[PDB]
Amino acid sequence: MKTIIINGVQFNTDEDTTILKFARDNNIDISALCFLNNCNNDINKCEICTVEVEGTGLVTACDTLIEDGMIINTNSDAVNEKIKSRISQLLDIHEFKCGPCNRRENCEFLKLVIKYKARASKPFLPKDKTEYVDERSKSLTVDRTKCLLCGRCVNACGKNTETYAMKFLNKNGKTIIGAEDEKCFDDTNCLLCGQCIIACPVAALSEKSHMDRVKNALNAPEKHVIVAMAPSVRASIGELFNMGFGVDVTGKIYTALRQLGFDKIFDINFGADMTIMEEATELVQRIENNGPFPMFTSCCPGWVRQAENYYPELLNNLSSAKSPQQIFGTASKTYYPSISGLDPKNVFTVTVMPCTSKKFEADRPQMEKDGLRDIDAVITTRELAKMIKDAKIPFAKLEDSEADPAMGEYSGAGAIFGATGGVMEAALRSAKDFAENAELEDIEYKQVRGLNGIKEAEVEINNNKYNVAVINGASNLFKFMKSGMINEKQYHFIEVMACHGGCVNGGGQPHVNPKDLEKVDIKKVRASVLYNQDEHLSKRKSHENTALVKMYQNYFGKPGEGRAHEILHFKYKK
Amino acid sequence: KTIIINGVQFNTDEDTTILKFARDNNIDISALCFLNNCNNDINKCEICTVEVEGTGLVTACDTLIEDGMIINTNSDAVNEKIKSRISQLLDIHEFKCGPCNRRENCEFLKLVIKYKARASKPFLPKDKTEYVDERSKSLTVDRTKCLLCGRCVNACGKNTETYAMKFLNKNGKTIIGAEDEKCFDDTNCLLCGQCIIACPVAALSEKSHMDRVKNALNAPEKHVIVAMAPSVRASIGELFNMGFGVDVTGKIYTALRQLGFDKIFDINFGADMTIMEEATELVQRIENNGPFPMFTSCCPGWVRQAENYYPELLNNLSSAKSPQQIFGTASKTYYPSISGLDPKNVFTVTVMPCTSKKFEADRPQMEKDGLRDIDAVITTRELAKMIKDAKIPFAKLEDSEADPAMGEYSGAGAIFGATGGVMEAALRSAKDFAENAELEDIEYKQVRGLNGIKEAEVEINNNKYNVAVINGASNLFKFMKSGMINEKQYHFIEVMACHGGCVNGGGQPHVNPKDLEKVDIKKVRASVLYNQDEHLSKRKSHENTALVKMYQNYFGKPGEGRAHEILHFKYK
Numbered sequence A: 001m002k003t004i005i006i007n008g009v010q011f012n013t014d015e016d017t018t019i020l021k022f023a024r025d026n027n028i029d030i031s032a033l034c035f036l037n038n039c040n041n042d043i044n045k046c047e048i049c050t051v052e053v054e055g056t057g058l059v060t061a062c063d064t065l066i067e068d069g070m071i072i073n074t075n076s077d078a079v080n081e082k083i084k085s086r087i088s089q090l091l092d093i094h095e096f097k098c099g100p101c102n103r104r105e106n107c108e109f110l111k112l113v114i115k116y117k118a119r120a121s122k123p124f125l126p127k128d129k130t131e132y133v134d135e136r137s138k139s140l141t142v143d144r145t146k147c148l149l150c151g152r153c154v155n156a157c158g159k160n161t162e163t164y165a166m167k168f169l170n171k172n173g174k175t176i177i178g179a180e181d182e183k184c185f186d187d188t189n190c191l192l193c194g195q196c197i198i199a200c201p202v203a204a205l206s207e208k209s210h211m212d213r214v215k216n217a218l219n220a221p222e223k224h225v226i227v228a229m230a231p232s233v234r235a236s237i238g239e240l241f242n243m244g245f246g247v248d249v250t251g252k253i254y255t256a257l258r259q260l261g262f263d264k265i266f267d268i269n270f271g272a273d274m275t276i277m278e279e280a281t282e283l284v285q286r287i288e289n290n291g292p293f294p295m296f297t298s299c300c301p302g303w304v305r306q307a308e309n310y311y312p313e314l315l316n317n318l319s320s321a322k323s324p325q326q327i328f329g330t331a332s333k334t335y336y337p338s339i340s341g342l343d344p345k346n347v348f349t350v351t352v353m354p355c356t357s358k359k360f361e362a363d364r365p366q367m368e369k370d371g372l373r374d375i376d377a378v379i380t381t382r383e384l385a386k387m388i389k390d391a392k393i394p395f396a397k398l399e400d401s402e403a404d405p406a407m408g409e410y411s412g413a414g415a416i417f418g419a420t421g422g423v424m425e426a427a428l429r430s431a432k433d434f435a436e437n438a439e440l441e442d443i444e445y446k447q448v449r450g451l452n453g454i455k456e457a458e459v460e461i462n463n464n465k466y467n468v469a470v471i472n473g474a475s476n477l478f479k480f481m482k483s484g485m486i487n488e489k490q491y492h493f494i495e496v497m498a499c500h501g502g503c504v505n506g507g508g509q510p511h512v513n514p515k516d517l518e519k520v521d522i523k524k525v526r527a528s529v530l531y532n533q534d535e536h537l538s539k540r541k542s543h544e545n546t547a548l549v550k551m552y553q554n555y556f557g558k559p560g561e562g563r564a565h566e567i568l569h570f571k572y573k574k
Numbered sequence B: 001k002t003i004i005i006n007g008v009q010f011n012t013d014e015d016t017t018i019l020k021f022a023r024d025n026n027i028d029i030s031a032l033c034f035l036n037n038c039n040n041d042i043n044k045c046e047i048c049t050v051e052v053e054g055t056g057l058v059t060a061c062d063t064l065i066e067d068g069m070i071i072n073t074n075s076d077a078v079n080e081k082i083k084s085r086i087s088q089l090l091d092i093h094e095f096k097c098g099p100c101n102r103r104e105n106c107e108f109l110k111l112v113i114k115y116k117a118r119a120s121k122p123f124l125p126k127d128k129t130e131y132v133d134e135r136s137k138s139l140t141v142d143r144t145k146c147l148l149c150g151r152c153v154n155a156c157g158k159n160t161e162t163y164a165m166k167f168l169n170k171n172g173k174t175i176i177g178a179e180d181e182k183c184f185d186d187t188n189c190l191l192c193g194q195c196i197i198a199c200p201v202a203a204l205s206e207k208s209h210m211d212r213v214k215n216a217l218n219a220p221e222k223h224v225i226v227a228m229a230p231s232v233r234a235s236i237g238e239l240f241n242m243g244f245g246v247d248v249t250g251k252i253y254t255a256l257r258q259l260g261f262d263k264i265f266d267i268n269f270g271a272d273m274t275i276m277e278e279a280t281e282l283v284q285r286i287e288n289n290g291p292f293p294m295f296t297s298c299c300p301g302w303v304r305q306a307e308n309y310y311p312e313l314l315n316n317l318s319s320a321k322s323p324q325q326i327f328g329t330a331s332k333t334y335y336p337s338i339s340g341l342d343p344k345n346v347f348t349v350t351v352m353p354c355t356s357k358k359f360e361a362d363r364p365q366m367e368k369d370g371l372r373d374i375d376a377v378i379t380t381r382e383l384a385k386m387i388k389d390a391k392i393p394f395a396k397l398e399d400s401e402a403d404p405a406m407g408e409y410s411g412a413g414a415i416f417g418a419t420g421g422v423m424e425a426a427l428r429s430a431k432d433f434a435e436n437a438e439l440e441d442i443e444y445k446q447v448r449g450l451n452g453i454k455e456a457e458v459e460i461n462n463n464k465y466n467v468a469v470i471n472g473a474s475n476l477f478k479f480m481k482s483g484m485i486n487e488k489q490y491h492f493i494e495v496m497a498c499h500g501g502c503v504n505g506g507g508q509p510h511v512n513p514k515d516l517e518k519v520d521i522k523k524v525r526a527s528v529l530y531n532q533d534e535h536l537s538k539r540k541s542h543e544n545t546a547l548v549k550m551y552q553n554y555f556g557k558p559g560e561g562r563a564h565e566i567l568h569f570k571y572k
């Protein structure tokens, strides 16, 4: 056992952990900045977690293991002058203009500048932000006027994707973060998943803004602006209006969108039901043809990029169904004019996504038909929150409203798409019914749910056994393939999602303080909203969605063939 | 949350698994495929099964606790599930412990004994040859022992990121091995043996050199020299039930004499030699303004990593031979010059905590004048076996001393086995060399310890130089792929393939994952080495009296002449 003294309090412990973790567990404040999720910035450490170890001097608490005999002081004058000095040095390279800053309301650096009363030796007033800003990407934007060189984005990229697409670079003798060879991220092995953004304590990493695309369409007299939100938005955007965690705010979002001036309020969960219609049909077709197996889902554009960049040979095994976003968009330019009278050229389709890679998907050159984009703009959860606040809409006070049903109705199977294993469970509900020409009552597939990085189950379909896997995060895709787990049996259907936890933890989602993250499992609490909706919805299979059935009967015909295959599918390989 | 566990109620808000909550509460839940916070995601072993009243049978190693959970870890239903799974594993296990090299500390056997599980049908292959792969210079596989638990695959991925160890489908059967069933030496494998350390059975082993050694000892004309690595003296006592962190240096020396070795030397003497050459090289690069960075080259797992993944760095590797090979070279040249042995009859054996060292010793060009630097390498485990087989009462032995001519060592050589050891040792000599001084302050604590990537600014002749210590092969990938390498000009970088350094090498004693929850094995083994440094009168390699005499009388000046001629090795 070890005896540790911290601020004169004696602890007898058998734990092997860092000073920072031990002190936090015991309600002793130690500041931190570059430390996140059990890693700090190993070169040029920030030292904001400085403490004193008697006999040693100043040490960094976030990466020093406790040892028998240590006498630690966390709040001496010398400690506090060190930390204040380090923050002051960061202010010397930080454009400290929080008024217009997109992290004004939840910035970790501002909280430290306030706590320690730090101020720059010289205000940093960059004059050519075109040089510090890289907006070339369709998904990510770097603003190096805000960058603290804390390396949290680099660490998060490594842990979440193992691509190390985000790197430290030497640019004319100064350190920056960016992509390989300072390329546009899109032109590298980057997945555009935005997990680097989620890790960033400041406004240095952001989504690529589509707010001007949206505002300009709303204000254009002849544009009819459709909006539809992803499953995950209704389980998370309330966090940015101080409503707490795990609050279902679906009805408030519909009201806020109308108050923002959107012309039609639909829902991507309707598109999720469309994707299941096509993809469950495709899975039954492959079961009948004995393959090709495995079929992989194709609805996560981070995974599609990962396949393109690292496993191009699996592209022919991807489902050809468009993603909920893109399948919805396709219908919004074809079916929706047919039931509304809008000129298709004047429809402008906007999605609200928990995701940055969806902006890349929407802007893919072939994601259009007859000159009309499937999807004209994608705004993240964060961007929609900013629009609401800029409009002075009192979100938390709003009354609930409903979506326009024609492409707004959704089943419980669509509702759970945002959680890891949601696509899988939703697709099995329909595929089992299709294959057995039955209306089965047992529809919960709890074995594919939850936060294990690689999940598997054996399922019975029409008196045969099939193996499915759910791959929960891009790093786990690499693990699953490189370890040869894929070889241990014949897999028939595999869901892959780039973001651990599923879209509820996507790159466009609200930032959460790491000290709210202590007490809240954000992945499970956001996902719980979606499973709750499923549990209370009357229709829990995508093919029971009434508005969807009407659309197929009146416009698309039979899923998985013909017209539906013609325009609702996408050749990912070619 | 209040959770009952076998009747006992528990109050908690830890957000942890059943397994780890119980392990913390000293409640016994068995596990097999769970190690390093990962289980075998595909085909999980289910040995950690427990009963949550309400849900059913669940795997404790990857299921999170919840309020009011009532949990039975020992119900009749739990126990016949667990026994069924063990029995099914025995059905694919050649259960013949008598000659097995894990007989005394097999983790799987401890489980079998705990449940008194047996096969339903004993697995008794008449012809094992198709199950065994002994082609590698370092690693061997015996699939008649393999549980398909995935621990080696997870350990390779986490420790090295090479994923050279994989699940494969072979004739419709699942096996572990390398892609296309290649010899591991021909793959990107580092031969670090972290997979062996992770394996709970004898399926993965070191390539035995025990026959080389015994045949040399028994050959009348061979004069067998033996020398042990830093880490062996801090580890081998574990295999004699002496506990952790025990310095058994002097007992090892006595045991080696009782085994019949003809001369007892020490690789720490070779470590001091490596520092003489390498610190000299570092000072010469400083004077020459490069090339920088200089990388250490004394870890053959890192050398293979550089060869396979960073060939552009090979020109930056230090040309000093590793302590093993530099000692070997001297044992064939210097040692005959002070003894009268015919060089061709000298047979040099090292004892290493490491499997990659066998590959290093067998490298074609690791020889001079026809004489191998090193003729055999036995692991810590192999030496323990040899001692036990010879009926030597290790723990009862009185201390003896090494033969001093190549057996003396300084505290700088003593710390090599720990991550940051070479760095600290080398700086102690480089600063003295560069400043033409005898400096008093020699402790470089900032490069020590278990952080995966460590750095320090050091001042030599009033100039500042940047150093880094890369602690584990996966951290080398991180350092390079993250661009950390380009944040500043590094001048000297230590790289070690095994996290913790050689004290955590692939030839070391296996440790029960239960002992490993109570003991920081990396720190406790390293502590022995730093303790020796603390208590040695000479703490700089260039103060080693035997070494100084050998340079004065035989090799001349480090970095020049005969020393450059035979004590260096260039990778190209």
Ligand code: 402
Binding pocket: A229, A230, A231, A232, A233, A268, A269, A271, A272, A299, A300, A301, A323, A324, A325, A326, A353, A354, A355, A358, A417, A418, A419, A423, A497, A503, A504, A506
């Ligand atoms: N398109 C689509 Fe998806 C749907 O439906 C989203 O909108 Fe996802 C979410 N939430 C996102 O971003 S994408 C990947 N599949 C799971 S959910």
Ligand code: 402
Binding pocket: B228, B229, B230, B231, B232, B267, B268, B270, B271, B298, B299, B300, B322, B323, B324, B325, B352, B353, B354, B357, B416, B417, B418, B421, B422, B496, B501, B502, B503, B505
């Ligand atoms: N040769 C050499 Fe080394 C020395 O001295 C050993 O013997 Fe190591 C140990 N212990 C091993 O194996 S190698 C890697 N450098 C650090 S220590």
Ligand code: SF4
Binding pocket: A094, A095, A096, A097, A098, A101, A102, A103, A104, A105, A107, A108, A109, A110, A146, A202, A203, A204
């Ligand atoms: S990143 Fe934070 S401190 Fe900097 S300008 Fe924005 S809100 Fe202010």
Ligand code: SF4
Binding pocket: A140, A156, A157, A158, A160, A161, A163, A164, A165, A166, A185, A189, A190, A191, A192, A193, A194, A195, A196, A197
């Ligand atoms: S978007 Fe994802 S893959 Fe690209 S740098 Fe960020 S974390 Fe890495």
Ligand code: SF4
Binding pocket: A146, A147, A148, A149, A150, A151, A152, A153, A154, A177, A199, A200, A201, A202, A204, A205
């Ligand atoms: S972009 Fe953000 S996370 Fe990355 S180094 Fe800069 S401040 Fe840190």
Ligand code: SF4
Binding pocket: A192, A193, A299, A300, A301, A302, A303, A354, A355, A356, A357, A358, A497, A498, A499, A502, A503, A504, A505, A506, A507
């Ligand atoms: S998991 Fe969801 S949020 Fe993350 S990249 Fe894929 S689609 Fe986007």
Ligand code: SF4
Binding pocket: B093, B094, B095, B096, B097, B100, B101, B102, B103, B104, B106, B107, B108, B109, B145, B200, B201, B202, B203
């Ligand atoms: S691996 Fe373990 S159980 Fe199997 S034969 Fe060897 S000692 Fe016995």
Ligand code: SF4
Binding pocket: B139, B155, B156, B157, B159, B160, B162, B163, B164, B165, B184, B188, B189, B190, B191, B192, B193, B194, B195, B196
């Ligand atoms: S020896 Fe090391 S690199 Fe090779 S398979 Fe084993 S763990 Fe992986």
Ligand code: SF4
Binding pocket: B145, B146, B147, B148, B149, B150, B151, B152, B153, B176, B198, B199, B200, B201, B203, B204
């Ligand atoms: S070799 Fe060992 S660790 Fe690897 S799967 Fe077989 S029993 Fe498990």
Ligand code: SF4
Binding pocket: B191, B192, B298, B299, B300, B301, B302, B353, B354, B355, B356, B357, B496, B497, B498, B501, B502, B503, B504, B505, B506
């Ligand atoms: S760190 Fe030591 S034990 Fe591990 S491979 Fe390198 S030399 Fe061998």
Ligand code: FES
Binding pocket: A031, A032, A033, A034, A035, A040, A041, A045, A046, A047, A048, A049, A050, A060, A061, A062, A063
């Ligand atoms: S928080 Fe510890 S060094 Fe940055």
Ligand code: FES
Binding pocket: B030, B031, B032, B033, B034, B039, B040, B044, B045, B046, B047, B048, B049, B059, B060, B061, B062
């Ligand atoms: S130890 Fe839990 S499934 Fe193997």
Ligand SMILES: [Cl-]
Binding pocket: A364, A365, A366, A367
């Ligand atoms: Cl395209």
Ligand SMILES: [Cl-]
Binding pocket: A404, A405, A406, A407
């Ligand atoms: Cl409508």
Ligand SMILES: [Cl-]
Binding pocket: B363, B364, B365, B366
């Ligand atoms: Cl060679």
Ligand SMILES: [Cl-]
Binding pocket: B403, B404, B405, B406
């Ligand atoms: Cl001697």
